With several copies, the nearest count.
Chain A
Amino acid sequence: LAGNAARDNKKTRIIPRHLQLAVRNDEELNKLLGRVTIAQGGVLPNIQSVLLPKKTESSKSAKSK
């Protein structure tokens, strides 16, 4: 699973980031090895929907305010 993440990252070597991937994406592999800190492991792009307002980038009321 780590090798698959490396292919998506386009880098052959499994960077510790690539090992951080394939661990949090699968719950079964996350139930194991869960309460751990991966050395030099980047966090998954977990973003809440509230952080992207959209709505024409204007006020909720009428017109651009």
Chain B
Amino acid sequence: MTESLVLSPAPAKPKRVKASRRSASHPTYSEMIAAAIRAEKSRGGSSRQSIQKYIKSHYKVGHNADLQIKLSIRRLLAAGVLKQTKGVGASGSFRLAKSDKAKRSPGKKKKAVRRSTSPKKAARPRKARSPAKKPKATARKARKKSRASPKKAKKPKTVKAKSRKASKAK
């Protein structure tokens, strides 16, 4: 039909121009779902809210994208790209389809840092009490007074055992 390849692209051309180009400005048309999957970091990406909040940036909108999202996801599970799991409290469970048997019950696995913000609690009785407990996020507490080791820390850092003491004495 002419509507799909001649008429409709004409008004959306400026939106697509502002969208992804060779300058790596944005993800492509069929990879926004993959972007949602990698950025979700949860048990399952919600069908509506998560996808909207990860595609909130500037792209082809108003072009009936609220049907085009459905029409695009309607062509993804053919090659085993995405799959779904059951739930009670999630609007959607779109997940990456990979070598986890795709039929596994939820478990537990986490890996983050929380004692990384602990040595300010050691500098408090030792050095100073500048932070006032607010700046605990990643980009915060980077206003210098933020060090953990000697010069070698910026380069590949070492645990600097007793051998490093003799090396420094050298």
Contact = CB atoms under 8 A, between A and B. Distances in A.
Nearest to B72: A65
A63 B70 CA distance: 9
Interface string A22-44: 00000000000000000000000
A59 B68 CA distance: 12
Contacts of B70: 59, 61, 63, 65
B71 interface: yes
Interface of B is mostly: helix
Contacts of A61: 70
Interface residues of B, number: 3
Interface string A43-65: 00000000000000001010111
Nearest to B71: A65
A15 B33 CA distance: 64
B134 to A, nearest CB: 45
Contacts of A64: 68
Interface in B36-82: 68, 70-71
A64 B68 CA distance: 8
Interface in B89-132: none
Nearest to A62: B70
7 contacts: A59-B70, A61-B70, A63-B70, A64-B68, A65-B68, A65-B70, A65-B71
The 5 closest A-B pairs by CB, nearest first: A65-B70, A65-B71, A65-B68, A61-B70, A59-B70
Given A59-B70, A65-B68, A65-B70, 5 more contacts: A61-B70, A63-B68, A63-B70, A64-B68, A65-B71
